Design an enzyme around this catalytic site. Structure first.
Site, PDB file in Angstrom:
ATOM      1  N   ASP A   8       0.760  -1.276   0.060  1.00 62.61           N
ATOM      2  CA  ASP A   8       0.163  -0.025   0.041  1.00 62.61           C
ATOM      3  C   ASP A   8       0.712   1.312  -0.005  1.00 62.61           C
ATOM      4  O   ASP A   8       1.870   1.317   0.582  1.00 62.61           O
ATOM      5  CB  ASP A   8      -1.119   0.008   1.301  1.00 62.61           C
ATOM      6  CG  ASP A   8      -2.037  -0.921   1.127  1.00 62.61           C
ATOM      7  OD1 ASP A   8      -2.275  -1.276  -0.068  1.00 62.61           O
ATOM      8  OD2 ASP A   8      -2.730  -1.114   2.007  1.00 62.61           O
ATOM      9  N   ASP A   9       0.295   2.465  -0.293  1.00 65.69           N
ATOM     10  CA  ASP A   9       0.406   3.679   0.351  1.00 65.69           C
ATOM     11  C   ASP A   9       1.507   4.700  -0.707  1.00 65.69           C
ATOM     12  O   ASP A   9       1.560   5.733  -0.627  1.00 65.69           O
ATOM     13  CB  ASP A   9       0.889   3.793   1.349  1.00 65.69           C
ATOM     14  CG  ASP A   9      -0.210   3.798   2.762  1.00 65.69           C
ATOM     15  OD1 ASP A   9      -1.324   3.334   2.304  1.00 65.69           O
ATOM     16  OD2 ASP A   9       0.176   4.151   3.849  1.00 65.69           O
ATOM     17  N   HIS A  60      -5.781   2.395  -4.278  1.00 72.38           N
ATOM     18  CA  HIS A  60      -5.985   2.675  -2.646  1.00 72.38           C
ATOM     19  C   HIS A  60      -6.533   4.007  -2.243  1.00 72.38           C
ATOM     20  O   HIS A  60      -6.331   4.828  -1.306  1.00 72.38           O
ATOM     21  CB  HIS A  60      -4.657   2.284  -1.898  1.00 72.38           C
ATOM     22  CG  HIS A  60      -4.560   2.297  -0.473  1.00 72.38           C
ATOM     23  ND1 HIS A  60      -5.270   1.756  -0.016  1.00 72.38           N
ATOM     24  CD2 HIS A  60      -3.706   2.589   0.434  1.00 72.38           C
ATOM     25  CE1 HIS A  60      -5.135   1.692   1.377  1.00 72.38           C
ATOM     26  NE2 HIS A  60      -3.942   2.440   1.506  1.00 72.38           N
ATOM     27  N   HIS A 151       3.220  -2.385   3.251  1.00 69.45           N
ATOM     28  CA  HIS A 151       3.421  -1.073   2.998  1.00 69.45           C
ATOM     29  C   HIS A 151       4.716  -0.794   2.068  1.00 69.45           C
ATOM     30  O   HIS A 151       5.757  -0.939   2.969  1.00 69.45           O
ATOM     31  CB  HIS A 151       3.179  -0.025   3.990  1.00 69.45           C
ATOM     32  CG  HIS A 151       1.996  -0.047   4.677  1.00 69.45           C
ATOM     33  ND1 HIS A 151       1.656  -1.098   5.595  1.00 69.45           N
ATOM     34  CD2 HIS A 151       0.954   0.689   4.620  1.00 69.45           C
ATOM     35  CE1 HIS A 151       0.497  -0.770   6.088  1.00 69.45           C
ATOM     36  NE2 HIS A 151       0.016   0.212   5.344  1.00 69.45           N
TER      37      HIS A 151
HETATM   38 MG    MG Z   1      -2.989   2.833   3.415  1.00 70.79          MG
END
Ligand code: MG
Length: 205
Positions: A8-9, A60, A151
């Site tokens: 993610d991210d 996301h 992440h």
């Molecule tokens: Mg996130």
């Protein structure tokens, strides 16, 4: 035995490249759940590098806000604007959504026409946790079909790339093969069907 390593991210030119370098070293495919705010000229090449290297890109959201109490219009905008920048730079369009903070509602499910994924977490948003601890968290939790939620981008220290030096060899030696989300569904014979209003932490559900 199949797992899906997911991140993610990002994208972040510096931090995401650390993850991509590990995946190149081990010849492993993964899935990146990207945040629309971060996808721009500056990050176009690294987004394209994902595609070029056999990785998948999912959505996301536009930003870092929980979406569960958002209006349909707010949800729609966040998801569409993210898809548009991904298409522009990657040449693809997402099949999977990871809700910010893993927070869902009926309204969120009703207004996102993507397959929702969660997955096994590994405390890798907590900078005091080490590479070895992140790896232990993943290795002891996985089973056939697990979606692993890591992440690529967090405030530092962020030794998630270094965790992959343990995770990837250990799971390979235990008989696992690493696949993208699309591949995980396909190889398991599960249609990638956004009419399913449930969050997948593994495949099958
Ligand atoms: Mg996130």
């Amino acid at each position: 035995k199949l797992v899906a390593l997911t991140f993610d991210d990002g994208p972040d030119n510096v931090l995401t490249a650390r993850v991509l370098d590990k995946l190149d070293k081990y010849n492993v495919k993964a899935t990146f759940m990207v945040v629309g705010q971060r996808v721009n000229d500056s990050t176009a090449a690294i987004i394209r590098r994902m595609v070029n290297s056999g990785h998948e890109i999912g959505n996301h959201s536009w930003s870092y806000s929980g979406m569960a109490n958002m209006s349909p219009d707010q949800i729609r905008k966040s998801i569409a604007d993210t898809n548009a920048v991904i298409q522009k730079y990657a040449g693809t369009t997402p099949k999977f959504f990871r809700p910010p903070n893993l927070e869902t509602s009926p309204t969120l499910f009703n207004n996102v026409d993507l397959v929702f994924v969660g997955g096994l977490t590994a405390n890798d948003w907590i900078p005091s946790t080490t590479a070895e601890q992140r790896a232990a968290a993943v290795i002891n939790g996985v089973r056939d079909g697990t979606i692993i939620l890591l992440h690529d981008v967090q405030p530092e220290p962020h030794p998630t790339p270094e965790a992959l030096d343990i995770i990837i060899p250990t799971l390979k030696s235990r008989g696992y093969e690493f696949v993208t989300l699309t591949e995980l569904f396909t190889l398991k014979g599960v249609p990638i069907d956004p009419s399913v209003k449930r969050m997948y932490n593994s495949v099958p559900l």
